[PDB]
């Protein structure tokens, strides 16, 4: 359920690279992996393929 995710604060950067920001709830995933960290503002652009 992504209702709480979308109900959290507005996001500076929300990019989905492979799936659709909106269709993430009709698809069944396999392993899911969550990685949480704090970085500077300009270093967000470095976290991309």
């Amino acid at each position: 359920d992504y209702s709480v995710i979308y109900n959290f604060a507005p996001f500076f950067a929300f990019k989905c690279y492979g799936v659709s920001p909106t269709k993430l709830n009709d698809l069944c995933f396999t392993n899911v992996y969550a990685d949480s960290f704090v970085i500077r503002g300009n270093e967000v652009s470095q976290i991309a393929p």
């Binding site: 492979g18 799936v19 709830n25 698809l27 069944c28 995933f29 396999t30 992996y33």
Partner: protein, 49 residues
């Protein structure tokens, strides 16, 4: 918070809102079986899984 998934055949895991429907047989129907999407007729199978 980087989310990492692997949508390959969607075997089993995060499966999102899951409204289900009673199984039907011998009818050309659309099926979404655990993330596996297709259309076809469904018969009782003698294959030994």
């Amino acid at each position: 918070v980087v989310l990492s998934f692997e949508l390959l055949h969607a075997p089993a895991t995060v499966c999102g809102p899951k409204k289900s429907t009673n199984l039907v047989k011998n009818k050309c129907v659309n099926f979404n079986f655990n993330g596996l999407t297709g259309t076809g007729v469904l018969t009782e199978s003698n294959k030994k899984f």
